[PDB]
Amino acid sequence: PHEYEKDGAKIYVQSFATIRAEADLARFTPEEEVVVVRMIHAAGMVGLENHVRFAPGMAIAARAALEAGAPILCDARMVSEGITRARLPAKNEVICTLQDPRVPALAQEMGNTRSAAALELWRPKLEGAVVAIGNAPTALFHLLNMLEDPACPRPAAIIGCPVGFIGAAESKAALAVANPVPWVIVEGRLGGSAITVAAVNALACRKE
């Protein structure tokens, strides 16, 4: 039979050590470095770190919000379903409104995507939330427009990591320029649900 390593806790340790031995992580603060390592781990890609950008203090602020019980608002089910419940510090609610039955008609009325329209349903949980956008550039652009209104509830942090060829790089560059609340992005086309989930999981628990 095929022989292979079967100890999961050991595989995690070995993966993180391989990443730290290869990656270019010097510019990151200790709180940022742990997040970047987990993102590289999720992507299977040393080199991803050259694209990661944080607002100063974001990693400290997002961990404090999660420890205070902040909900995590997710643009897609792959993100909400990926968050490790066992790593959550304060029984944090993990929400995704994409599949709400009111979303298809609301998107039609708004002239926007279902991913963006679903963010309107985040309003009651948005104040102090940790936002996790790993898919949809239109959700990130729409959130920036929602936050231009002073009446809109404001999240504690935004993990803005949508992936893609159309609008993704622009949505993340616009988030960093707008600086609405503390943020982290993967500049360019890279991103996605796995990288976004890894950022949430890294910030949720102090143990790698």
Ligand X SMILES: C[C@H]1C2=N[C@H]([C@H](CC(=O)O)[C@@]2(C)CCC(=O)O)[C@]2(C)N/C(=C\C3=NC(=C\C4=NC1=C(CCC(=O)O)C4(C)C)/[C@@H](CCC(=O)O)[C@]3(C)CC(=O)O)[C@@H](CCC(=O)O)[C@]2(C)CC(=O)O
Residue 198 touches which member of a second copy, ligand X, none, C-beta under 5-8 Å by kind: ligand X
Q: Are 139 and 74 in contact (CB under 8 A)?
A: no
Active site residues: 41
Minimal distance in Å, beta carbon 200 to ligand X? 8
| Nearer to a second copy (CB atom), residue 57 or residue 188 | 188
Task: Write out the residues near a second copy by the rule CB under 8 A.
Answer: 1-2, 4-6, 8, 11, 14-15, 18-19, 41-45, 77-78, 81-82, 111-116, 137-138, 141, 144-145, 148, 163-168, 170-171, 174, 188-194, 197
Neighbours of 180 (CB within 10 A): 16
- Angle (deg, nearest 10), helices 30-43 and 58-67: 80
Task: Quote the least distance from Cβ 150 to ligand X, whole Å.
Answer: 25
Of 146 and 163, which has the nearer Cβ to ligand X?
163
Rounded to whole angstroms, the Cα distance separating 141 from 167 reads 9
User: Which tokens sit at 47?
Assistant: 């080199």
Q: Which is nearer to ligand X, 99 or 145 (CB)?
A: 99
The answer to whether 140 and 171 have CB atoms below 8 angstroms apart is: yes
Q: Which C-beta is closer to ligand X: that of 29 or that of 113? A: 113
What number of CA atoms fall less than 13 Å from residue 19's CA on the CB side? 24
Q: How far is the CB of 87 from a second copy (least distance, A)?
A: 15
Q: Residue 87: which of 199, 7, 206, 196 has the closest Cα?
A: 206
Residue in the structure block whose two tokens are 């409104």? 97
201 binds, among a second copy, ligand X, none (CB under 5 to 8 A by kind): ligand X
6 binds, among ligand X, a second copy, none (CB under 5 to 8 A by kind): a second copy
92 binds, among a second copy, ligand X, none (CB under 5 to 8 A by kind): none
Query: What is d(CA 116, CA 106) in angstroms, rounded to the nearest whole number?
Result: 10
CB-nearer residue toward a second copy: 64 or 174? 174
Q: Which residue ranges make up the site for ligand X (CB under 6 A)?
A: 8, 11-12, 15, 38, 41-42, 76-78, 82, 84, 98-99, 113-115, 134-139, 162-168, 192-194, 197-198, 201
Alpha helices (runs of H) in the chain, residue ranges in sequence order: 8-22, 30-43, 58-67, 77-82, 103-110, 114-118, 123-126, 137-146, 168-178, 193-204
